[PDB]
Every structure is written in C-alpha cells, then in structure tokens.
Design a protein around this ligand. Structure first.
Ligand code: QUC
Length: 167
C-alpha cells in the first residue's frame, strides 16, 4: 500500500491521473519524482520549468553544479539528484526532443531508467514541449517500465484521450 490516490490502473504496474505533477509531488512527497530533463539540466519550461520553480530555483542551482562536475547527460540517460521540497529524490530523465530531431527510439532507453526505482511519480517522457506523441509515450512506458509508475498528466483533454485510446 502506498499514498497515491485517485489513479486509474492501466496495467499491473502503471497508473495514471489527470494532475499537476508539482501539486501531486507536494502532497505525496514520493521517494522519486521524475523530471522531463534535457542534457544540460536547464529547467526552463514544461515539466522541468514547473518543478524547478516549485523548488525556488534550488533544483537549477544543484543541477548547474552537477553539470559543471560531470558534463551533460546522454539523450536517453538520467541522473539522481535531490527532490528538494517535492520528493526525496528527483530522477532527471532525458527523453528525445522531437523539436531537436532526436531519435524517437531513444524513448525506450529513457524509460528504462525508471526500472532502477521501485516506485515513481512521473510525467510522460518526450510529451509536451518535447514534441512526441503522448499516446506513443504511454505505450512505450507500459511496454518498458516494470516498476510501479504513477503518471501525472496535466492536460485534462489529453488525459481523457490517453485513457480512451489505451489498448
Ligand atoms: C506533457 C505535458 C502535458 C501534461 O502533462 O498535462 C500538457 C502540456 C504539454 N506537457 S509538457 O511538455 O510537459 C509542459 C509544458 N509546460 C508545462 N508546465 C507544467 C507542466 Cl506540469 C507540464 C508542462
């Protein structure tokens, strides 16, 4: 038993809710919240900009030190940093950005990072401003992640379309 509430169960291990991931993180304080990161950990907009804003820019300060030490992430890669006031940890995961021409096949590699964590609160990778089809992202999620994932979808219209078209 965990504290996630109001989710629709899609599979044995994947759950979905129309929710603002920032507000959901603030309420649940999950062990892991996933950020929709880029390789530079520049949290300017989308999910990343919202999570960072909610940390009063502490996520960005920590991220800048991480990059100065380690260099950029790989597309499809991840790093674990603090969850600040939102979660114990933040798993920064880089899905491919279609608006940069990145290979969509890397979306599966991106989701594989979730398997290193027993339970996660997450957005749909490569959705939103990353330009991928969210229905496809959900399919890759279900077919790749084996750990327990609670997906927060900000847009109610998109949430209803994801549920209604889910196979
Ligand atoms: C897939 C989501 C989708 C959702 O999950 O409802 C709705 C719009 C597109 N994006 S987005 O790229 O991540 C995004 C852009 N700005 C944002 N600000 C805050 C938050 Cl929480 C998410 C975003």
């Amino acid at each position: 038993v965990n504290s996630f509430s109001g989710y629709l169960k899609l599979t044995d291990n994947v759950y979905i809710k129309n929710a603002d991931i920032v507000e959901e993180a603030k309420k649940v304080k999950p062990t892991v919240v996933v950020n929709a990161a880029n390789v530079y950990l520049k949290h300017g907009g989308g999910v990343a900009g919202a999570l960072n804003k909610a940390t009063n820019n502490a996520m960005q300060v920590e991220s800048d030190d991480y990059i100065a030490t380690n260099g950029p992430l790989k597309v499809g890669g991840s790093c674990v940093l603090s969850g600040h006031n939102l979660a114990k940890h933040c798993l920064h995961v880089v899905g491919p950005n279609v608006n940069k021409g990145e290979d969509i096949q890397l979306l599966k590699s991106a989701y594989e990072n979730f398997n290193q964590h027993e339970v996660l609160l997450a957005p749909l990778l490569s959705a939103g401003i990353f330009g991928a089809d969210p229905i496809h992202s959900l399919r890759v999620c279900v077919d790749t992640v084996r750990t327990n994932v609670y997906l927060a979808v900000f847009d109610k219209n998109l949430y209803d379309k994801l549920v209604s078209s889910f196979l």
